[PDB]
């Protein structure tokens, strides 16, 4: 009574699963070349060592930001929309949306590549925020990301046109509440008929517990390097694990679905658009 | 000038370094076959899935312990002295002690292999506690680890001879204060002339900050799989990194020290006693 990747594929092709909820992490973005600011070896890391940071995570701490906002904006400059492109996984999720199968996509990433691949914001829950928009720290005025792009690309600290306060990208900092849209989980997970987990161990709350928020009959497909976290600890009969490289597994599923041509077409058009 | 592993070895041979402080983590004990209770695939993990645990870490939580002490004692039965043997790393630390070079050994491990390899308790700081001793949960009476051994091996919950309360191994649970002996760091790190880090990323405080408690002139030698943590973020001129297999790096250091034969003899004698 065990399920295969092909079983899930056929479930999707037959539209027995048409309300798919997806949870993704850093694993899906490393094929795009997104540098880990915590890991040594990248130019970002080196550039970050120049400052008086006690540890890397201090970049997402408000006290340090208000002490010195330049490291964070080093990171922002590195990850701002345009510098990096979506890869095959992002476009698979996009195709999932286009065929009317994507209920919601919950992401922990801040590279904003889900948005860049053409998935509408309403299908997204950017749980750690985004660089696509910013808010002034003083007068709370909202700004599109573009409005400060120049300043960010010129290593200048963006100042509000009204009160001259620092304009900060809408990245969620430590201590800050998760975005309001996160609460969509309340309705999304009971409604899901398929749970897709990509490039994340989901060992950190509140995401870990969300894996058990789907109904018991609902298949949970993990495409990850390892089988760890709540899916390893609390397995269900209809769990499917495609262990190994994320890109490889996603491509496998895409083939089993018979979407390869549609996929290459999509990627051609979209890379063409950029 | 940058230092090499051989430079450190020669420093030790000349006893320019005779007050070595060592910090170790999970890395040095996996060659001994110590199962990660968090990771699937071990018999321990399987046995722990038997209970109504929300996550593995709950075996180290007091409310769960007082709700049901059996999972913890499953772990205790698995890791109790005798079931596992020290490896080359442990015995290297042992030889380090025998030659009068070990100031203190700070460990995050609870496998008790430092004691079994023959390092005296006074030279140890078991920062997450130990199975070598136990305390009654009701009347606070102390007991040697051996005193409850039978009960632990017979799947019985050890009860105090005085008040019949549960006798709990001196493992530090989440929320509990670190052992008193941890504060020895206050005097140990300023006195160290060599800092040795084995099999740990040192990502968690208060261990992270301790890497910087040694004087600036003091060499910090890392023998680990990766170069991460405070050693990576805040490098010093006299830092040395032996990246790769922990056993391999340790063996390399042993050869450079010219202790290889003594090491072979020691490991043989001690394995002989077991």
């Amino acid at each position: 009574g065990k399920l295969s990747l092909q079983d899930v594929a056929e479930l999707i092709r037959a539209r027995a699963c048409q309300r798919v909820v997806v949870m993704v992490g850093a694993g899906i973005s490393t094929p795009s070349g997104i540098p880990d600011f915590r890991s040594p070896g990248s130019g970002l890391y080196s550039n970050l060592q120049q400052y008086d940071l006690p540890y890397p995570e201090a970049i997402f701490e408000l006290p340090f930001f208000f002490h010195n906002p330049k490291p964070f904006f080093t990171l922002a400059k590195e990850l701002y929309p345009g510098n990096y492109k979506p890869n095959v996984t992002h476009y698979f999720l996009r195709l999932l949306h286009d065929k009317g199968l994507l209920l919601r996509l919950y992401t922990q990433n801040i590279d904003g590549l889900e948005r860049v691949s053409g998935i509408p914001a309403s299908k997204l829950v950017e749980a750690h925020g985004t660089f696509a928009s910013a808010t002034c720290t003083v007068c709370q005025r909202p700004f599109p990301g573009e409005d400060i792009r120049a300043d960010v690309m010129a290593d200048r600290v963006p100042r509000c046109p009204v009160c001259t306060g620092v304009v900060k990208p809408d990245i969620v900092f430590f201590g800050e509440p998760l975005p309001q849209r996160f609460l969509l989980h309340v309705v999304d997970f009971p409604m899901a008929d398929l749970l897709l987990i990509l490039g994340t161990s989901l060992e950190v709350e509140p995401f870990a517990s969300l894996t058990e928020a789907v109904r018991s009959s609902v298949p949970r497909l993990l495409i990850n390097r390892d089988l760890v976290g709540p899916l390893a600890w609390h397995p269900r009969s209809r769990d499917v694990a495609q262990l190994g490289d994320v890109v490889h597994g996603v491509e496998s599923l895409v083939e089993l679905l018979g979407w390869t041509e549609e996929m290459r077409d999509l990627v051609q058009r979209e890379t063409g658009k950029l | 000038g940058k230092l090499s592993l051989q430079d450190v070895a020669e420093l030790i041979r000349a006893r320019a370094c005779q007050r070595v402080v060592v910090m170790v983590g999970a890395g040095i004990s996996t060659p001994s076959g110590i199962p990660d209770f968090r990771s699937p695939g071990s018999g321990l993990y399987s046995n722990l899935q038997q209970y109504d645990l929300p996550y593995p870490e709950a075996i180290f939580e007091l409310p769960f312990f007082f709700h049901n002490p059996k999972p913890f004692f499953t772990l205790a039965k698995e890791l109790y002295p005798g079931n596992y043997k020290p490896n080359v790393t442990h015995y290297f630390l042992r030889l380090l002690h025998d030659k009068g070079l070990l100031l203190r050994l700070y460990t995050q491990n609870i496998d008790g292999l430092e004691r079994v390899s023959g390092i005296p308790a006074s030279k140890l700081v078991e920062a997450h506690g130990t199975f070598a001793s136990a305390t009654c949960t009701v009347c606070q009476r102390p007991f040697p680890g051996e005193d409850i051994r039978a009960d632990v091996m017979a799947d019985r919950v050890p009860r105090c001879p005085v008040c019949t309360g549960v006798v709990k191994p001196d493992i530090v649970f989440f929320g509990e204060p670190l052992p008193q002996r941890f504060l020895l760091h206050v005097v140990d790190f300023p006195m160290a002339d060599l800092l040795l880090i084995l099999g740990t990323s040192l990502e968690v405080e208060p261990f992270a900050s301790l890497t910087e408690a040694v004087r600036s002139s003091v060499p910090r030698l890392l023998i680990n799989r990766d170069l991460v943590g405070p050693l990576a973020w805040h490098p010093r001129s006299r830092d040395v990194a032996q990246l790769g297999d922990v056993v391999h790096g340790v063996e390399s250091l042993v050869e450079l020290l010219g202790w290889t034969e003594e090491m072979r003899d020691l490991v043989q004698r001690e394995t002989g006693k077991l």
Binding site: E57, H128, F173, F174, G175, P177, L178, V204 | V204
Partner: peptide, 8 residues
């Protein structure tokens, strides 16, 4: 140790 973003 690690830091959280809080659920409200």
């Amino acid at each position: 140790t690690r830091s959280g973003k809080v659920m409200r």
